[PDB]
Amino acid sequence: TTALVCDNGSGLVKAGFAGDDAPRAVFPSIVGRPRHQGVMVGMGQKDSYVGDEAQSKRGILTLKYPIEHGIITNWDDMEKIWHHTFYNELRVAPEEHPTLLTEAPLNPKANREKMTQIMFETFNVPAMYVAIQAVLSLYASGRTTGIVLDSGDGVTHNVPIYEGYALPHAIMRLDLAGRDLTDYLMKILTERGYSFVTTAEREIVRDIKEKLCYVALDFENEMATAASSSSLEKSYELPDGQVITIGNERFRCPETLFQPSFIGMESAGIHETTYNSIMKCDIDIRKDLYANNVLSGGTTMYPGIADRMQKEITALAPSTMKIKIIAPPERKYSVWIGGSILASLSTFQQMWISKQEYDEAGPSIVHRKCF
């Protein structure tokens, strides 16, 4: 048989078979329903639109995200998305395919319990397993030590690992992620005159952020430069024309990751949380954590993020320590590649949660010897 690797994530679902190099199917985790009435008779449209199909009919739909920050708030929509992934995209029956799921650190136990219950009872998978994003990112990066930063669309967390031994007391979790950046981009575009409110225009703002935004090495210097020169303006084409221009907002939105005070958050920037997490570890393992800083996740795909992160860390870390940052080109799909590597290991075949074993041990088996 073969193993199936899934990654619910947040805002993007990427799933495929184990042993492959890239996910076979990638689509947003969006479920939509029509908010209008409809006058044509005999069309026979379905009740709800899920996955990438709902993106093609964005104009007559309202979009809801079942996952807010790692956790799952709506379960019927989550089951719909899982059914879509298992049937429409992969065309495989989950009755004979073990499923490896992915979960963020510092999450409620109820999430894992309900995930396993739905997987075992609604889909009848022969076996399953739940794993942490950061460990699988470290698997994909080819390292065995080093503090790893994972900033997706829902949550940002740092997990330091040394010689294959995790340090749970030094794991930091922050809710600042891409969705908050998109919301701040909305809040800042109104200053120029462009107002986006509808959930359909959330995708437009997200596309603008993805294709146009960049991280500035210096904030004050860039603000001074853009206040006089006009070389920073770039134009964007809306889905119906009406070209728009954007100036300072090009680099102010990503600065929220380093200046959380922009959106009123009390916490400090990722450049400081990473250093704090490194300092929470021992004193003999800090060299390898400094020299093996790993970045992964969608929000990390900003151009110029690595240079600013390294500059800030070097400004914080002692001058003697060498600071290195690993930013592979395939940062977004690092977690899935790590999952594909892990599920194909021979020693992993006895760490699955079996069907009868789960039946004996109850839904709370997840936190037992089998993780």
Next chain:
Amino acid sequence: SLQKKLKGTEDELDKYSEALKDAQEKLELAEKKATDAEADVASLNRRIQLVEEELDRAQERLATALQKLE
């Protein structure tokens, strides 16, 4: 009479429309290439100045160590 003139005009319109479409496609291709090159060169500008400053302070430290050793 007029029908051949209209047919020729339509054929010319189609030909110039195809040429215009190709012109755009090449325009976005060139613009994307130029933007990528500009982003890369700016990033490694920042890298090269920071590296040069690192070399400068390394030389200063070496001079201080040399005089202290003397």
Next chain:
Amino acid sequence: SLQKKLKGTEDELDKYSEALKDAQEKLELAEKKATDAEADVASLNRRIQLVEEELDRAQERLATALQKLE
């Protein structure tokens, strides 16, 4: 009846030709900018390696001077 259609076709053909000329001009400008950026980045990446080796030699000399000082 057909005269208005012919006039509209001629007008849109003229607009298409003007757009084509503008597209060619913009493509030429973008290509020139891309070539300039490529030359600049080539010089930058061929001189950054010299800067890196210089700083490495400086830091090695710093280390050996510190050892002799100790």
